[PDB]
Amino acid sequence: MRNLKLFRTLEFRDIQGPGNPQCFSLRTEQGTVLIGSEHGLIEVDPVSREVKNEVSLVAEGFLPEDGSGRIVGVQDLLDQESVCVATASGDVILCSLSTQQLECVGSVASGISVMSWSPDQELVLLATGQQTLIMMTKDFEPILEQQIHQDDFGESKFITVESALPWDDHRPQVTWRGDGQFFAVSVVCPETGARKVRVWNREFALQSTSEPVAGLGPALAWKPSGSLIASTQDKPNQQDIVFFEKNGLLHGHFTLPFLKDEVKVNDLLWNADSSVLAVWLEDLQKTCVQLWTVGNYHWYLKQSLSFSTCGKSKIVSLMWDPVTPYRLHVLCQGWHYLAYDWHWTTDRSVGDNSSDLSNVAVIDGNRVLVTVFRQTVVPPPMCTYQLLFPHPVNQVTFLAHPQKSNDLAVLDASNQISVYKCGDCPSADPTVKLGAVGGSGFKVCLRTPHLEKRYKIQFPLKLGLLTWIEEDVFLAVSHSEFSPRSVIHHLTAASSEMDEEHGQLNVSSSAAVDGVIISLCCNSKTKSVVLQLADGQIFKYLWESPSLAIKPWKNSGGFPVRFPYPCTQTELAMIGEEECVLGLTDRCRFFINDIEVASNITSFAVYDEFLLLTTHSHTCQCFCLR
Amino acid sequence: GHTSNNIYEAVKYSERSLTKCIGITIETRPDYCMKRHLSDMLTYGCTRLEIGVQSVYEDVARDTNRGHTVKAVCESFHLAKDSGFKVVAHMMPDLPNVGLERDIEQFTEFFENPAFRPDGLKLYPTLVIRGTGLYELWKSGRYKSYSPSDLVELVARILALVPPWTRVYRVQRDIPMPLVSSGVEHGNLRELALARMKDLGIQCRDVRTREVGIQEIHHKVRPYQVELVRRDYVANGGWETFLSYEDPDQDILIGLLRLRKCSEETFRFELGGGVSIVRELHVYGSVVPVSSRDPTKFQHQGFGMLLMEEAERIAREEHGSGKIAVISGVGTRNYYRKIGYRLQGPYMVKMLK
RNA sequence: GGCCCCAUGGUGUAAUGGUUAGCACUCUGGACUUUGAAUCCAGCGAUCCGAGUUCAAAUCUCGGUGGGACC
Ligand SMILES: CCNC(=O)CCNC(=O)[C@H](O)C(C)(C)COP(=O)(O)OP(=O)(O)OC[C@H]1O[C@@H](n2cnc3c(N)ncnc32)[C@H](O)[C@@H]1OP(=O)(O)O
Ligand SMILES: C[C@H]1O[C@@H](n2cnc3c(N)ncnc32)[C@H](O)[C@@H]1O
Ligand code: MET
């Protein structure tokens, strides 16, 4: 059980590509990005914000000079450093940006319906305009061609003793398996007027066929680890997501948090981990995108964020990073590009051990589940008690005050701040409900929280991570695409001169520093705040800051401590008298004040006296840190 | 040894007998799982049940002409667990229209899903035998088995997946050899799986393979430092809870307990409100006569007392209930009498205030 | 009375001047929460005794032990 937290983002607008984007690919090693435009190809590195190469098949002649065709597909290739390209007219071409070696490598007497590349870059597979499929070797040598609408359930058979949606595009879709051994097609059935799916092996033998199901959608996505193929279906009162096996039978599903016939949906994207999944929704007469998660066969909508459909801000496309499973790229029609990153966390709370209750909070949907562990232990799902909310929350945090670390803060999607205090409230607001602890006659004598405040902001994610240093002081971080830097903020408490459940917190100050502040933490006992820069530089910032007090973290010799890597998290400790720092990376590498100490660590924790670790070698151990 | 006239007379007489019977278990199928039959079995002192699942895919049932739905199995599990019995499932690898990957996926599902999370497990590989339709199906050369190596790998992978609380009871059938058209040569398979999992260097955590008796009789390892361990999960809507004493360094186990909170929906009104049921309790080892105290060994050192008091404390505080009920064998009731437990219906019970 | 012959697992036996006596019947254990007995697997059994020789001896010598046919 964990919850994702946004780590860092990268936004890039104002790309001068001719015409408009059509598609794009990514240059993994090069660190740049491809662009499919109406006139030619463009390559640019994001952090550079500089174009490297330009071409125009309009200038060459293949692309309609007036501009009428589109690039069906662009796919980066690393062996030859030359990128293949597909034409709406049905022309496959190869070129290299190094010297502009554009030259037609083949064509068909139809348009290229779609271009597919084997996950191992071994093979290619394309669809024609005359409803047939063309398989070819690595170098465009035609392997075979076969008609799409044959009549069989597939080679894999069984032994034993109403119409397409109005908003359907009728565009066929295909996908690979995660092993490069099976691929599934999702052509709309011309005969039944519905959607149909078939699956074939690496040999290109017709393995299996889908089953008659009403309300089928056009979307499709194979799970990277296999055995699961995603699809969407609308039922008389609800839009749901269903799954399929390699046998091509329905198995498992989960519903959506929206009403009946409200919004349009696009296809589904898997992260590199095969764990996280992302869904694209279109506001049907305000699009959105959501990050779901399955846990113990329960589906958790861990994240979501929306956007406006106004043309330039209307999104063009997006893509998972095929290297880091928690990295995303996206681009919108205002010739703009953007990048996003996340990392895991648990969201625990620590205060005075006598008074603290070892409470733990988890986020799901428009609600938060809380479990107090000083007295109770419940196995997720379920929880001690839950708090409801109108629309989905994004991230939460506990109060950082000692002997008080039992009240948290909630950040809803629409810039709403919810305060819940566990004081001796006589009457409980209806938002608080009890989980497994409640029942018919079962009774407990714990202390419950209550709603306190619903604040707003007083001047798409205008702010980054949220921290609650003290009852009245919150902190966040911004960015800047030009001249990369971050800004701290000082959202103090505005007094209650309105509905006492309201009040807009305003920026007392905006502390600005250069570079990307990837992380930050603080200690209540020391009342000190220290951040980690993207460089691994460690900088204590005086949260008091009578005048912008900044100081890089000092070693025992009074010199800077520059972490050799970007930490996945940060921590303060009280070793002997030293206020040393703690951190680690995803690579099990552990360092202390720029001293590596171990490489088998998978997790750690400390509650004011002891450091506990989880070796990758299946062991734990404690230490008296004083 | 006393001639009787009805069930109840025999029950009352066996109460005071010295053979000290501790329970019975019966097989069944989900059709006969309504609360009427459960109440009937409550009158017999039965403890555990057999169902026969054979799959996790509904289509297979009609393919196998089973004649019911997997759903009914699921509600039978939920209802029986709410009542307080134990359940052992039957798994049926290498079935028609089932790939090897299908078997792996379904077996993983069998524990990944909170729907099932069963307690007792039994496995029986497919065996084509003359007389059945499958006999002709294979005879027509249309139903094929695996090679023995495939079965060994399948079993070895499966054993790596069993959750610690689940206990395996048997592997393979006991059918005479010169009758099966696809019977494996080896009457012994657990050993072959053990060899294979040594080859792969991955270990299993079954209860039967970590109790003191088997571990000593097969490896001669003496426990040295035994401590407590607590775990919990969710199954059929229940808040299950598992307690044990065991020595972790050798991973050898001595005593166990299974206790949960009753579901909001129940059949026995005696459990209505402030009630937590303890499904079962047991310490492994060997038989020690009730009068005898210490042949060294580990069966009368007062271990059960600590588990009872701690489970009671948990139910009083964490469950927040108000009265503890428990099922028991006919003789075992007297045991609970020593702790101040009194009878009510077929259930032993103690007030919690 | 001597000549010969023999002495290996509990029994029936191979083997032989050198790092390990191999089988066979038998017995024992696990698979097995359906089985002492079944099916498989695994395991425990040994050169008559004392003197010699030989680097080295069950195999070469002598003596003894006990047993087996000879006039
Ligand atoms: C519920 C049906 N299932 C079972 O019964 C499983 C088999 N049960 C057992 O083997 C044992 O009862 C246990 C698993 C509880 C292990 O016994 P445990 O070590 O916990 O007993 P304790 O050491 O705590 O207490 C000892 C007392 O239990 C008594 N006792 C043992 N068996 C029984 C029994 N069937 N019925 C009543 N009292 C018993 C002993 O006579 C002893 O009394 P003592 O003062 O004269 O010595
Ligand atoms: C006792 C369990 O074994 C199954 N079962 C019973 N007889 C056979 C057989 N010949 N082959 C396979 N499974 C069998 C039952 O259906 C039940 O699940
Ligand atoms: C002996 S077969 C298993 C028990 C029962 N006959 C059933 O199939 O449900």
B12: its two tokens: 């009352």
DSSP H or E stretch at residue A301: strand A298-306
Closest alpha carbon to A585 in A311, A331, A343, A414:
A343
Residue pair B13/B3 in contact by the 8 Å Cβ criterion? no
Q: Is the CB of B188 under 7 A from strand C?
A: yes
Length reported for chain B: 353
Of B101, B232, B317, the CB nearest to A379: B232
The rounded radius of gyration (Å) of the Cα atoms in chain A is: 27
- Please give the single-letter amino acid code of residue A424: D
Residues contacting residue B316 through CB under 8 Å, at least 6 positions apart = B352
Sign of CA dihedral A183, A186, A190, A191: positive
Q: How far is the CA of B284 from the centre of ligand 1 (A)?
A: 12
Q: Which residue in the block uniquely carries the two structure tokens 């009245």?
A: A472
**Tokens encoding A7:** 């780590």
Rounded distance in angstroms from the CA atom of residue B130 to the C1' atom of nucleotide C39:
20
B50 in contact with A at a CB cutoff of 8 Å?
no
Instruction: Name which residue sits closest to atom 1 of ligand 3, judged by CA.
Output: B27
Asked whether the CA dihedral B16, B19, B22, B23 is positive or negative, the reply is negative
In 3-state terms, what secondary structure has residue B156?
helix
B44: tokens are 């017999």
Q: Give me the sheet containing A250-255, strands edge to edge.
A: A221-222, A229-235, A238-244, A250-255
Q: How far apart are CA A531 and CA A537, in angstroms?
A: 8
Report the 10 Å Cβ neighbour count for B237. Answer: 15
Report yes or no: A422 and A405 within 8 Å, Cβ to Cβ.
no
Looking up tokens 């409550």 gives B42
Atom of ligand 3 nearest to the CA of B50: 4
Return the closest nucleotide (C1') to the Cα of B167.
C33
Inter-chain touch B274–A441, beta carbons under 8 Å: yes
Cβ contact A531:A558 at 8 Å: no
Q: Which of B102, B113, B320 sits opposite A297 (nearest CB)?
A: B113
Q: State whether A375 and B317 contact (CB < 8 Å).
A: yes
Buried b (16+ CB within 10 A) or exposed e, A244-283: bbbbbeebeeeebeeeeeebebbbbbbbeeeebbbbbbee
**Which bases along strand C come within 7 Å of a protein CB atom?**
30-35, 38-41
Report the amino acid identity of residue A152. Answer: D
| Residue A600: C-alpha distances to residues A587, A614, A619 (Å) | 9, 8, 10
Q: Which residues of B touch A158 (CB under 8 A)?
A: 63, 97
B247 vs A264: CA distance, rounded Å: 57
Cα A347 to Cα A362: distance, rounded to the nearest angstrom: 7
Out of A227, A296, A444, closest to residue B320 by CB: A444
Which whole-number Å values give the CA distances from A535 to A145, A516, B25, in the listed order? 53, 8, 66
Rounded to an integer, what is the distance from CA B65 to the centroid of its chain?
Answer: 27
| Phi then psi dihedrals of residue A13, to 5 deg | -110, -175
Task: Give the residue before each break in chain A, using a C-to-N cut-off of over 2.5 angstroms; say none if it is continuous.
Answer: 161, 285, 459
What is the spatial distance between Cα A493 and Cα A43, in angstroms, rounded to a whole number?
A: 47
On whether the CB atoms of residues A111 and A127 are closer than 8 A, the answer is no
Q: Indicate if CB(B282) is under 7 A from strand C.
A: no
Taking CA atoms, A183 is separated from A208, A273, A583, in Å, by 10, 20, 43
Counting beta carbons within 10 angstroms of the beta carbon of residue A21, is it exposed (0 to 12), middle (13 to 18) or buried (19 or more)? buried
Within the 264-283 window of chain B, which residues sit less than 8 Å (CB to CB) from chain A?
264, 272-275
Distance CA A517, CA A477 (A): 8
CA distance A199 to A479: 46
Across chain A, how many H-helices and E-strands are there? Answer: 1, 52
Q: Is-contact A428 A407, C-beta < 8 A?
A: no
- The closest of B111, B49, B71, B51 to B279, measured between CA atoms, is B49
Question: Tokens 């995303």, residue?
Answer: A328
Map tokens 């209505």 to a residue.
Answer: B272
CB distance A570 to A581 below 8 Å? yes
| Contacts for B28 with CB less than 8 Å, ≥ 6 apart | B37, B49, B50, B51
Asked whether residue B191, judged by its CB, lies under 7 Å from any atom of the DNA or RNA strand C, the reply is: yes
- Cα angle value A486/A487/A489 (rounded, 5°): 150
The residue lying closest to nucleotide C38, measuring its CA against C1', is B176
Helices (H), B169-302: 190-200, 212-219
B122 sits in which H/E element: strand B120-123
Q: For atom 15 of ligand 2, which residue has the closest CA?
A: B52
Ligand nearest to the CA of residue B16, numbered in listed order: 1
Look up residue A369 and give its two tokens: 């589940």
Give yes or no for residue B335 CB within 6 A of ligand 1: yes
Coil, strand or helix at B96 = coil
Task: Provide, in whole angstroms, the distance separating residue B152's CA from nucleotide C9's C1'.
Answer: 38
Instruction: Give CB contacts under 8 A, 24+ apart, made by B337-345.
Output: B339/B305, B339/B308, B344/B270, B345/B42, B345/B268, B345/B270
- CA–CA separation, B343 vs B327, rounded Å? 10
Burial of B227 (0-12, 13-18, 19+ CB in 10 A): exposed
CA distance A334 to A337: 9
Q: Which two tokens stand for residue A144?
A: 């075979």
Contact present, A101 and A93 (Cβ < 8 Å): no
Q: Are A363 and A348 in contact (CB under 8 A)?
A: no
B47 lines ligand 1 (CB under 6 A): no
Work out which ligand 2 atom sits closest to the CA atom of B132: 10
Q: Output the known binding site of B for acetyl-CoA.
A: 280-283, 303-305, 336
What count of Cα atoms within 13 Å lies in the side-chain half-sphere of residue B201? 0
> Rg for chain B (alpha carbons), in Å?
22
C-alpha A105/C-alpha A92 separation (Å) is 6
Residue A342 CA, chain-centre distance (Å), reads: 6
Asked if A338 and A329 count as a contact pair (C-beta separation under 8 A), the reply is yes
The strand order across the sheet containing A393-398 reads A393-398, A408-412, A417-421, A450-458, A504-506
Q: Kindly determine whether residue B234 and residue A382, on different chains, have CB atoms separated by under 8 Å.
A: yes
For B346, list phi and psi in degrees, rounded to 5.
-90, 15
Bridge partners of residue B190, in order along the sequence: none
Instruction: Please choose, from the candidates A265, A270, A233, the residue with its C-alpha nearest in 3D space to the C-alpha of residue A250.
Output: A233
Q: List chain B residues with CB under 8 Å of A153.
A: none
Q: Smallest Cα–C1' distance to nucleotide C39: which residue has it?
A: B187
Residue having the nearest C-alpha atom to atom 41 of ligand 1: B290
- CA atoms of A406 and A384, how far apart (whole Å): 14
Q: What is the DSSP letter of B319?
A: I
Please report how the helices B148-159 and B100-112 are oriented relative to each other, as an axis angle in degrees rounded to 10: 20
Tell the burial category of A556 from Cβ atoms under 10 Å away from its Cβ (0-12, 13-18, 19+): exposed
- Å between CA of B181 and C1' of C49: 60
Let me know: does A280 contact A263? Beta carbons within 8 Å: no
Nearest by Cα to B172 from B198, B199, B191, B197: B191
Q: Are A11 and A329 in contact (CB under 8 A)?
A: no
The residues with which A133 forms a beta bridge, in sequence order, are: A127, A146
Q: Which residues of B belong to the annotated binding site?
A: 280-283, 303-305, 336
DSSP states of A302-350: EEEEE---SSSSSEEEEEE-SSSTTEEEEEETTTEEEEEEEEEE-----
Distance B335 CA to ligand 1 centre (A): 7
Other Cβ atoms less than 10 A from the Cβ of A238: the count is 14
Question: Relative to the CA of B30, which ligand 3 atom is closest?
Answer: 9
Question: Distance between CA atoms of A104 and A178, rounded to whole angstroms?
Answer: 31
Q: Which tokens is A251 given?
A: 């198995």
B96 touches chain A (CB under 8 A): yes
- Helix, coil or strand: residue B194: helix
Residue B137 touches chain A, beta carbons under 8 Å: yes
Residue of B nearest to A246 (CA): B102
CA A487, CA A339: separation in Å to the nearest integer?
A: 19
Residues of A in contact with B115 (CB under 8 A): 297
Q: A539, A626, A621, A614: which is closest to A581 by C-alpha?
A: A539
Alpha-carbon torsion (A561, A562, A563, A566), positive or negative: positive
CB contact under 8 A, A161 and B101: no
User: Is A342:A5 a contact under the CB 8 Å cutoff?
Assistant: yes
| Spatial contact of A37 and A21, defined as CB atoms under 8 Å apart | yes
Of A284, A276, A319, A281, nearest to A300 by C-alpha is A276
Nearest residue, CA→C1' of C42: B191
For A216, half-sphere exposure in the C-beta direction (CA atoms, 13 angstrom radius) is: 26
User: What is the distance between the alpha carbons of residues A516 and A534, in angstroms, rounded to a whole number?
Assistant: 5
Q: Are A405 and A360 in contact (CB under 8 A)?
A: no
What is the distance in A from the centroid of ligand 2 to the CA of B132? 12
Which of B26, B29, B124 for mutating ligand 2's site (highest number of atoms within 8 Å of CB)? B124
Pairing of strands B275-278, A611-615: unpaired
Amino acid, single-letter form, for residue A286:
K
| CA of residue B57 to ligand 2 center, whole Å | 17
**CB atoms < 10 A from the CB of B4, how many?**
12
